[PDB]
């Protein structure tokens, strides 16, 4: 009776408010620090979501930690893309109900380029007219799409979970359309989007890494996010991580 997709709908966390203070000088540093504060709280939600995600807690605890540390920015950027798609059709960055960034508020130092990168992710949801259930299944697969080159401790459990949610994405596609005639074409398009997320998020991550390590910029990070980045960053820069791609890339 209960389907995996119906459970994904039910565990999806509610959207957080930023509590942003509009009376303060609109500056790039203040904005980046406000966004990181929101990001730390969204990462906490995401960890609670992963604990509730069927199958995830069967992984060794060190693998649960690895997957969340490696994929957090993909998860956050994908969900920002979805919110921006549903709330503005990809025209504004809809970070929170009380923090919406339109094109002219983007005209800020360093900010404009990173903001355009985030809009491109939203623009793919518009292009493909992604359904909610396709989005939820894809989001699981982002949690499961970056791993150490040397492998995981519970590799057999991981391979089982990942294959389970690849199957579930297929079920979401069938549920969407009704003419199964495009089901393979749709699966191809969405797995190409998954593969492309590694490149689309890579530039966000490099910028985050720079603002993290370069204390001169005075960008603030909250404690749990700082801990995660401090563990993720050396593995990423050393080339010890690999993306799990569906297609020849």
């Amino acid at each position: 009776f209960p389907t995996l997709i119906s459970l994904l709908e039910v565990i999806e966390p509610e959207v957080l408010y930023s509590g942003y203070d509009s009376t303060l000088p609109d500056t790039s540093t203040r904005l980046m620090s406000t966004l990181n504060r929101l990001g730390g709280r969204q990462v906490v939600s995401a960890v609670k979501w992963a604990k509730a995600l069927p199958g995830f807690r069967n992984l060794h605890l060190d693998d649960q930690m690895t997957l969340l540390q490696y994929s957090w920015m993909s998860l956050m950027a994908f969900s920002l893309g979805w919110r921006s798609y549903k709330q503005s059709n990809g025209n504004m960055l809809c970070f929170a109900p009380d923090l919406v960034i339109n094109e002219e508020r983007m005209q800020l130092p360093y900010m404009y380029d990173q903001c355009q990168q985030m809009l491109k992710i939203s623009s793919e949801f518009v292009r493909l007219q992604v359904s909610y259930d396709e989005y939820l299944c894809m989001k699981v697969l982002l949690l499961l799409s970056t791993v150490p080159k040397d492998g995981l401790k519970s590799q057999a459990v991981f391979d089982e979970i990942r294959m389970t949610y690849i199957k579930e994405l297929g079920k979401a596609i069938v549920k969407r359309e009704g003419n199964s005639s495009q089901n393979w074409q749709r699966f191809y398009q969405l797995t190409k989007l998954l593969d492309s997320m590694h490149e689309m998020v890579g530039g966000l991550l490099q910028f985050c890494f720079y603002t993290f390590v370069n204390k001169s910029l005075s960008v603030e990070f909250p404690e749990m996010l700082a801990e995660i980045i401090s563990n993720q960053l050396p593995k990423f820069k050393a080339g010890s991580v690999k993306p799990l791609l569906f297609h020849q890339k």
Partner: peptide, 12 residues
């Protein structure tokens, strides 16, 4: 223990 580990270990 990191904050992430504590959260993963917390009942919920």
């Amino acid at each position: 223990p990191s904050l992430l580990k504590k959260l993963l270990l917390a009942p919920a």
